Amino acid sequence: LADDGIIDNAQDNVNATLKSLTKQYLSVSNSIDETVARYKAQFTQLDTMMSKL
Amino acid sequence: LADDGIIDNAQDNVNATLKSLTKQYLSVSNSIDETVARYKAQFTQLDTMMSKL
């Protein structure tokens, strides 16, 4: 139950995994933002072409 | 009936005018072909975009 026990190693490994997860999530999030923005733009141009009925 | 004749000169002028108009028709035809080529490129692009979705 000490601050430097086996629990401490387990929990700081958990925290490091959490921070790596957050970093990877942010990177993939900006990538997804760019991709989805391009897809929504594509939807806009196809709607504009469909407007020419 | 001869070349100096007014009717012969009139029909010569008529054929010259219609040949100039045929040149104009060729110009309009190639412009139409270019515009149709662009339109078909856009149609194929639209087909590709709809296939992606």
Side-chain angles (χ1 to χ4, degrees):
Chain A
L1 266 190
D3 281 349
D4 71 326
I6 312 296
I7 54 171
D8 184 74
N9 290 318
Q11 63 194 5
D12 70 0
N13 267 1
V14 165
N15 296 6
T17 302
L18 275 151
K19 84 180 189 300
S20 171
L21 181 146
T22 315
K23 186 268 303 173
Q24 176 205 7
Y25 175 78
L26 292 171
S27 306
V28 76
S29 289
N30 65 61
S31 165
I32 283 158
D33 284 344
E34 190 275 332
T35 53
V36 176
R38 190 180 70 83
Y39 308 151
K40 296 294 186 290
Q42 178 179 2
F43 290 153
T44 69
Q45 291 90 21
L46 66 87
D47 283 337
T48 64
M49 311 165 198
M50 271 155 178
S51 315
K52 328 299 180 163
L53 204 44
Chain B
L1 60 87
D3 184 5
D4 60 357
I6 180 64
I7 54 172
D8 199 0
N9 290 318
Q11 63 87 28
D12 297 339
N13 298 319
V14 161
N15 68 53
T17 302
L18 68 89
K19 284 195 303 314
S20 60
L21 293 177
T22 308
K23 299 165 177 55
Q24 185 186 2
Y25 213 80
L26 297 172
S27 311
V28 178
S29 303
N30 67 58
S31 65
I32 281 158
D33 213 348
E34 186 270 333
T35 43
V36 163
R38 313 315 308 132
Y39 205 108
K40 296 287 99 176
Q42 306 146 5
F43 204 50
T44 55
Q45 204 261 337
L46 180 149
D47 300 333
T48 53
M49 310 265 267
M50 301 335 307
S51 68
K52 297 261 191 82
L53 175 64

